[PDB]
């Protein structure tokens with residue numbers, strides 16, 4: 001029987017490459033998505049062409065609210081429903097936008113989205129994953145720039161910091177259960193769709209290793225390692241995949 | 251004219267010591283409290299006896315909700331209404347209790363632990379800055395990289411607070427606002443905790459085999475807000491007696 | 499044809515496991531040794547039995563001295579000599595013993611502890627880069643932030659090695675040379691260590707209450723040198739079963 | 747009676763600022779120096795003109811060598827010789843120059859960069875503690891240790907090792923009531939060899955006031971850490987960098 005993984009925000013970009021690589025490695029996959037319905041269904045189609053009944057989609061808002069626990073419970077449930085097991089959780093889904101300290105969304109909405117997706121939803125999915133429980137592990141998508149934050153990204157940066165906190169806290173507490181918890185921290189990888197070309201090239205010029213962003217596949221490569229038998233004694237570790245970017249002074 | 255500080259959760263323990271030392275240095279103080287009204291008022295009365303019209307209290311629940319931004323606005327506004335200025339903000343109030351992964355709902359715990367330790371400090375920072383030797387001190391935790399077992403949300407909250415400290419330090423530097431942290435290891439221990447358990451923690455501390463007094467924590471806050479720290483921002487000063495350096 | 503790796507301190511324990519795993523992956527190997535000649539040649543015999551002329555031995559003291567730079571140049575040279583190329587350097591060799599602050603001279607201990615753990619890696623890094631999927635992997639230590647009591651020089655050495663890892667990752671990136679680290683917590687316990695003290699450490703490990711095998715450490719090295727780590731430089735992977743997360 | 751302090755490389759710049767501030771606080775000082783004899787004697791004269799017999803100079807090379815432990819022991823002995831006690835040690839002296847990976851020999855650069863930044867602090871710490879109330883050591887570190895200057899590997903290795911020492915010694919000497927802490931400047935006084943344009947390039951990166959720390963600003967954090975207001979602080983390294991370390995590439 002093939003193992004199963006949940007990847008959140010798996011319709012596009014890094015999430016999608018993680019889903020594709022897990023599937024290539026022999027995993028059945030739940031493709032979680034929020035708005036990207038066509039892309040997710042299309043990904044599941046592609047993967048199911050390769051091996052039938054090895055991919056399903058699961059829709060959910062990971063914004064924080066009083067029903068977020070139910071939503072997170074359901075994403076894990078959906079893996080058991082489809083595949084009868086859940087071996088790997090990848091916490092990939094992420095809101096990323098500036099929240100300036102000095103001056104359409106209300107600040108509480110920005111808190112719910114940025115802290116919910118980057119931190120609370122991973123926490124709740126971690127609970128649900130562990131509650132429903134071999135090579136079990138969780139990989140959180142972190143950020144190599146957490147200590148050199150983007151200007152005016154306080155809420156986002158707080159979310160990612162809390163994610164590091166969860167990574168270590170869950171590694172420690174789930175170790176008795178044989179669930180490993182690790183992170184992968186991209187620096188610059190696939191740049192924002194809305195980011196302009198001049199900005200994209202400014203960030204690219206900053207990376208010591210090859211003056212370019214990471215491919216989604218290079219990030220996924222690190223996830224694959226962490227879920228594998230070659231990482232069986234590794235828990236609580238966050239692997240930077242940043243081409244040295246975090247080492248460059250101002 | 252005397253400067254003015256807001257200290258959150260200032261009725262008891264570390265918060266109280268901070269407020270008292272701030273007052274002794276010459277600050278007028280806003281004493282924020284949640285449930286400890288009698289203590290906050292008794293403190294205000296003591297400080298106003300020392301020098302009249304130098305202390306006020308302000309009640310607010312700092313749990314996250316749609317009304318938290320208004321609450322945080324109002325705490326900052328109360329410093330201006332009382333004293334005409336707000337020079338220092340100390341983010342001290344904190345919920346601290348276990349939240350194992352395997353009567354409060356989990357979302358109430360999220361609201362309380364993330365709210366007090368991170369969201370409220372962020373909102374108060376926005377309000378403090380929007381209203382402007384200005385500085386913010388956040389009360390962090392020296393043990394964030396070796397967390398208490400089954401305290402994931404508390405740990406997430408304190409990690410988020412480090413994030414805020416760094417982000418705000420960077421963003422507010424142009425306005426001349428410094429943002430720093432004090433990270434206690436073990437200080438004032440719970441009242442009801444058995445002496446034998448307190449002693450388990452005390453014996454772990456390399457420096458003197460004892461916990462920090464609240465005054466010792468307050469001392470580092472005093473340094474950070476003073477003219478002797480005028481180039482210091484985004485720094486978190488551990489006040490832990492070497493505890494975080496001790497391996498399991 | 500086949501890429502080539504230098505493994506320092508490769509005759510025994512974690513170094514041997516790294517060399518074996520590199521060889522199994524397709525590398526030709528230089529097995530460096532200081533005192534363990536019988537074991538190094540024994541490893542080479544086994545590897546060469548598998549594939550002819552794919553393993554050579556190299557003797558050098560990696561204690562700092564006036565001749566260390568020449569010794570380091572010659573270890574790198576011996577890889578080019580044997581195999582015509584040098585793709586991977588693994589800095590594994592390491593002196594480990596206490597140096598209380600309160601019969602080797604202290605300067606000998608400095609030479610051995612800082613030399614094996616930091617200066618030689620620096621010199622080998624220099625020679626490796628001078629002679630040029632290229633990478634260096636440094637064997638670091640997950641317990642650098644909570645060090646063993648009375649191990650200041652050793653701890654200073656492993657700290658400098660982190661510094662070298664980062665410095666060299668930055669400076670060598672334009673040459674396409676990646677520089678990374680693997681930080682064991684407790685793996686193969688020292689041969690000198692008593693049995694009850696071994697079990698004391700094992701009991702501390704959250705993931706399995708056991709030390710890492712040498713092979714499990716090697717697995718992380720193998721990942722870092724592979725095409726699966728092509729964007730990774732300046733990274734130090736902890737392989738510690740959660741040990742560094744455990745408060746005192 | 748007044749406490750005594752040893753400050754290494756104290757003839758000028760930051761080390762001088764630290765010994766002056768320690769002096770103004772009530773300390774008798776040992777002004778350690780290597781090549782800056784004129785400046786050290788000038789400083790001791792000023793401080794002695796302020797309060798008679800409250801400053802002595804002490805010459806020593808802090809380059810690593812087989813005699814370095816004896817030199818470091820002698821720096822500590824000189825404090826006890828002048829003042830009868832030694833309460834505070836500040837490890838400030840520092841060699842700082844590039845060592846690219848690709849007419850000093852490399853082993854001289856090791857000896858100077860690792861010697862001054864790490865080995866001497868370590869030997870001075872041994873001697874300080876061996877010779878032994880508010881006792882402490884302050885190590886002058888570097889806030890940019892994780893975003894190092896390009897081609898400064900040995901310097902960086904030395905400042906990393908100094909962090910290791912701060913933490914190791916803090917742990918080991920806590921039982922003796924010796925606190926061990928650090929102060930980490932980003933950009934403070936720029937090198938005298940730096941032209942104004944390069945200075946300003948660095949100045950413009952500092953979020954807080956777009957300027958370098960004064961020598962006094964660094965000394966302020968040293969003074970705090972040696973004081974009674976820091977009596978529970980050990981193994982801490984206070985960044986005094988105006989937010990520099992927080993700024994991405």
Ligand SMILES: NC(=O)c1ccc[n+]([C@@H]2O[C@H](COP(=O)([O-])OP(=O)(O)OC[C@H]3O[C@@H](n4cnc5c(N)ncnc54)[C@H](OP(=O)(O)O)[C@@H]3O)[C@@H](O)[C@H]2O)c1
Pocket residue numbers: 008009010011012013014015032033034035036037060061062063091092093094095096113117141142143144185186187188189190191192
């Ligand atoms: N790309 C980089 O350079 C970089 C750098 C540092 C860190 N990272 C981290 O690495 C991970 C992957 O990066 P990425 O750039 O691929 O991410 P991304 O495109 O910005 O976001 C990934 C997915 O997150 C989902 N998402 C956003 N808000 C959500 C919500 N409220 N509820 C549920 N899902 C939500 C979206 O799903 P739908 O499209 O289905 O709506 C989106 O496709 C993220 O955690 C990111 O923070 C990336």
Ligand SMILES: NC(=O)c1ccc[n+]([C@@H]2O[C@H](COP(=O)([O-])OP(=O)(O)OC[C@H]3O[C@@H](n4cnc5c(N)ncnc54)[C@H](OP(=O)(O)O)[C@@H]3O)[C@@H](O)[C@H]2O)c1
Pocket residue numbers: 258259260261262263264265282283284285286287310311312313341342343344345346362366389390391392433434435436437438439
């Ligand atoms: N004590 C330690 O050993 C230690 C260790 C590490 C870090 N710290 C940190 O240092 C700071 C001070 O510590 P402490 O032990 O003195 O604090 P504490 O007693 O645990 O809490 C301080 C105050 O926080 C306030 N608070 C709790 N929930 C609140 C809510 N929902 N809304 C508004 N206020 C709320 C309470 O005010 P009311 O009483 O008025 O309700 C409480 O008195 C805290 O940030 C703590 O996390 C302390």
Ligand SMILES: NC(=O)c1ccc[n+]([C@@H]2O[C@H](COP(=O)([O-])OP(=O)(O)OC[C@H]3O[C@@H](n4cnc5c(N)ncnc54)[C@H](OP(=O)(O)O)[C@@H]3O)[C@@H](O)[C@H]2O)c1
Pocket residue numbers: 506507508509510511512513530531532533534535558559560561589590591592593594610614637638639640681682683684685686687688
């Ligand atoms: N074992 C662990 O639990 C653990 C924990 C944390 C970090 N680490 C790190 O992981 C790496 C491997 O650990 P290990 O326990 O396998 O190491 P080890 O057995 O203590 O040492 C490995 C080899 O280093 C060589 N070496 C020692 N002094 C030398 C000198 N002066 N010159 C040249 N070579 C010298 C020796 O080679 P010869 O036998 O040929 O003389 C020795 O066999 C080391 O870097 C270590 O610090 C290990």
Ligand SMILES: NC(=O)c1ccc[n+]([C@@H]2O[C@H](COP(=O)([O-])OP(=O)(O)OC[C@H]3O[C@@H](n4cnc5c(N)ncnc54)[C@H](OP(=O)(O)O)[C@@H]3O)[C@@H](O)[C@H]2O)c1
Pocket residue numbers: 754755756757758759760761778779780781782783806807808809837838839840841842858862886887888889930931932933934935936937
């Ligand atoms: N200035 C900065 O922006 C900056 C930034 C980061 C960190 N720091 C750290 O803060 C401290 C003070 O900085 P600084 O710029 O004032 O220092 P510095 O001027 O570069 O050096 C201070 C003193 O170190 C002494 N020194 C150098 N080599 C020596 C040797 N081989 N033996 C004995 N003494 C030697 C010199 O003494 P003599 O003149 O008597 O020969 C020199 O005056 C240093 O540890 C530095 O690394 C400074």
Ligand SMILES: Nc1nc2ccccc2[nH]1
Pocket residue numbers: 094096143145150187188189191192203
């Ligand atoms: N999450 C995230 N962090 C980023 C930093 C730089 C560019 C794109 C990014 N996306």
Ligand SMILES: Nc1nc2ccccc2[nH]1
Pocket residue numbers: 592594639641683684685686687688
């Ligand atoms: N180098 C090194 N560091 C160690 C820590 C614990 C046990 C064995 C070890 N070997």
Ligand SMILES: Nc1nc2ccccc2[nH]1
Pocket residue numbers: 842888890895932933936937948
């Ligand atoms: N020691 C030291 N570190 C420095 C970093 C930037 C500019 C000058 C410096 N001097």
